[PDB]
């Protein structure tokens, strides 16, 4: 009979300490009653947040996933869950008369956060070029792809999630790939397209406090 919004109380969602804008926003949930709890129905929510809403001066077409992991009263503490580009940016880069090279690698950080990183890069027209198309041959595409996979593997394989996300914030990996592949075929729109989480160990709460603390 009664409206259900009198049975709800508002919580606050906190980003980790990689970002300087700590407060994401406000989520709500029904108050605990019976056998269903507020906290277990609150965990596992996913907040796709833009990067410009977490960093005050970074780009807007990159966005982060930030699953919630624990509840500290009126606060929902989140941890990194994935990264993606916006739809319009990805649709804006893909155009005709050039070759698109994509690569993906499955790879585990030091603390057991097995990821899947997707990369993308496009062949670049020279400034004095008068031919219409800029097409890499198949062997050039294959060794560019090989360089992409080896760079992503060496960048995330020897780190853990904190500085891996700190690499993903300015996308230094894409700049490394673009710098490395200039001797095969010059690429210009090189990004890490998408980061996917495949496995997480055991939820050490002290680690989540370290991420949310200093």
């Amino acid at each position: 009979v009664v409206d259900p919004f009198s049975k709800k109380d508002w919580y606050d969602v906190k980003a980790p300490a990689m970002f300087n804008i700590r407060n994401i926003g406000k989520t709500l949930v029904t108050r605990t009653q019976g056998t269903k709890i507020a906290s277990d129905g609150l965990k596992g929510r996913v907040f796709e947040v833009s990067l410009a809403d977490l960093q005050n001066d970074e780009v807007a077409f990159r966005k982060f996933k930030l699953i919630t992991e624990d509840v500290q009263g009126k606060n929902c503490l989140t941890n990194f869950h994935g990264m993606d580009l916006t739809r319009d940016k990805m649709c804006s880069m893909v155009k005709k008369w050039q070759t698109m090279i994509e690569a993906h690698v499955d790879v585990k950080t030091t603390d057991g956060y097995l990821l899947r990183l997707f990369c993308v890069g496009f062949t670049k027209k020279r400034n004095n070029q008068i031919r219409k198309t800029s097409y890499a041959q198949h062997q050039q595409v294959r060794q560019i792809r090989k360089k992409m996979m080896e760079i992503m593997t060496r960048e995330v394989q020897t780190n853990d999630l904190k500085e891996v996300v700190n690499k993903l914030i300015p996308d230094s990996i894409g700049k490394d790939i673009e710098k490395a592949c200039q001797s095969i075929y010059p690429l210009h729109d090189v990004f890490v397209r998408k980061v996917k989480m495949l496995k997480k160990p055991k939820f050490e709460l002290g680690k989540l406090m370290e991420l949310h603390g200093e």
């Binding site: 409206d3 919004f5 009198s6 709800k8 508002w10 969602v13 994401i24 926003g25 406000k26 989520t27 709500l28 949930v29 929510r45 996913v46 907040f47 833009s50 807007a60 916006t86 739809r87 319009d88």
Partner: protein, 140 residues
Amino acid sequence: EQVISLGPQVAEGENVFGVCHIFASFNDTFVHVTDLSGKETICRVTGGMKVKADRDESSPYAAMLAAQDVAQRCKELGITALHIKLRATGGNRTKTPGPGAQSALRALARSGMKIGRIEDVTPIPSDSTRRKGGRRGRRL
């Protein structure tokens, strides 16, 4: 305003956000509004909730009326700003949003709501799952 139980206890200058999933297809429009996660629904008004003619559920006027009702309800629940997630039918079928995206987004803005990020979330397949018309299509 204020209830004060319904609505978050916030300051007076800063604003609280929601997500407005606008499914504007042909034959209908949806002005669903959720919280930031998308798991909690605040309000949902569709175009067919406002007209009783069954051919203009996708008309811009019905989308405007749905957007106004959604804006009033979300305003009395304390939500003041919205991120927009525009959507067509997509997948196998058309990728152009329907006739009701126009007036729904305009009416949300003109009803006194702050607009955040706008994004397209139409489902795009990587060439999957054969469409229905037969091989010769629909011979209207």
